[PDB]
Amino acid sequence: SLNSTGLAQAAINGLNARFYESSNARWSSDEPWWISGVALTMVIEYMRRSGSKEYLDQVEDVIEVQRQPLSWWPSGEGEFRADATNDTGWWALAMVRMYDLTGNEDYLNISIKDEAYMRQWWTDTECGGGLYVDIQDLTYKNAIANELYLKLVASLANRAPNATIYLDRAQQAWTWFLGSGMINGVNLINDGLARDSNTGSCYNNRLPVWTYNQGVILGALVELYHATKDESYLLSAQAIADAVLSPSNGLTSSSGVLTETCEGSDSCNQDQQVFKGVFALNLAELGDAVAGASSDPDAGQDYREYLDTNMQSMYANDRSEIVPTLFDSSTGDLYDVSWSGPFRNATMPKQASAIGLYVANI
Ligand SMILES: OC[C@H]1O[C@H](OC[C@H]2O[C@H](O)[C@@H](O)[C@@H](O)[C@@H]2O)[C@@H](O)[C@@H](O)[C@@H]1O
Ligand SMILES: OC[C@H]1O[C@H](O)[C@@H](O)[C@@H](O)[C@@H]1O
């Protein structure tokens, strides 16, 4: 009885009415810039799966302005090339989805510039591969910057000209990620790697298991499947997704609701508030690829049922509505960080995570 398309549009309206800045062509200048890129990916994804184009003009506005050289990183020379490789990766993947929606080669070209920019900080001399996240310091090869890069080259291997060098880079990047040790004994991905002070060897730093570090890798393995037709990539993604859905690992509550590790202590900062929706959208990409790769009608049913359970829970316990006025006739929905907990406030990262879950059910 739940229309995920209608609720996604209501959440996007709530996101715009409360957090969109027309004068800046950006959501919430007080919140991390990379989350505007995630929010743009959510809006673009809503339009792709629903067939709507209500926000196409707004998206183009954001793209044209945020494409300019960043005031805090002019050496990047615009095209979303920022001071952290993970910032560039989020916008690069948004530009891939923009190309998927419009077919405009201009957006694909941004994604190609972003790939070359990110590879500038891939080094085989530390950890045998992988790239750094802190461009200025080069002290952290974490999980998210390398999952974003892996998903980028894997997508370019399916859409860009000269896609062979991108397929070669994606297969080598996955080989490094697998052998890095960041995937642990229960098939979940820790935050990043640390380096031995004496030997220079790298090891899993045992930092928290974040939901979006279990999601972006699924989209990367799905794009690696499309380019190779090798179901081995899907099986590896399925093992990671299964670990997230298993209540023994703590990411799935006893009610079957996705729960970030910081929700219990109510310590989720601006970054962590958006992590859940990123995983949900990527899990929908896996479930779609799994269902199409087999003739079983029940293929991917566990992932679809999981997304539906979380949608209903957040529908009933995490929802609020903006108060309409005599002057502002705007309508929509607002959401907090916990998909099962109550509503205390609504911020842009929590709103963006909200849209991602609804779009994952479209
Ligand atoms: O919150 C957990 C993550 O925290 C850091 O990533 C977020 C921050 O780092 C990015 O380089 C920049 O975009 C910042 O603006 C952003 O706030 C990393 O430690 C990451 O590995 C963690 O998962
Ligand atoms: O304002 C500074 C600007 O650059 C920083 O590196 C990032 O945190 C951005 O999110 C922020 O908007």
Residue numbers in the entry: 78 to 439
Reported in the publication:
To exclude the residual α1,6-mannasidase activity of CtGH76 under crystal soaking conditions, we generated single-site mutants for its catalytic DD motif. For the active-site mutants D164N and D163N, soaking with α1,6-mannotriose resulted in α1,6-mannobiose binding to subsites −1/−2, alongside with single mannose residues at subsites +3 and −4. When comparing the wild-type of CtGH76 with its aspartate mutants after soaking with α1,6-mannotriose, sugar residues at subsites −4, −2, and +3 adopt nearly identical conformations. Glycan mapping revealed that the putative substrate binding site of wild-type CtGH76 contains only single mannose units for α1,6-mannotriose, whereas DD motif mutants accommodate both mannose and α1,6-mannobiose within the binding canyon. Reduced activities of DD motif mutants, as observed in corresponding S. cerevisiae Dfg5 mutants, result in a complete loss of function.
We characterized CtGH76 from the sordariomycete Chaetomium thermophilum, a member of the Fungi/Bacteria-mixed GH76 subfamily, revealing conserved structural features and functional divergence within the GH76 family. Notably, our structural characterization by X-ray crystallography combined with glycan fragment screening indicated that CtGH76 can recognize GPI-anchors like members of the Dfg5 subfamily but shows a broader promiscuity toward other glycans with central α1,6-mannobiose motifs due to the presence of an elongated glycan-binding canyon. Here, we present the crystal structure of a novel fungal GH76 member from the F/B-mixed subfamily, in complexes with different glycans and glycan fragments. Together with structural bioinformatics, we found that members of the F/B-mixed subfamily act as secreted GHs in glycan degradation, which includes not only α1,6-mannans but also GPI-core glycans. Compared to other GH76 orthologs, our findings demonstrate that CtGH76 features an elongated glycan-binding canyon, adept at accommodating a wider range of complex glycans.
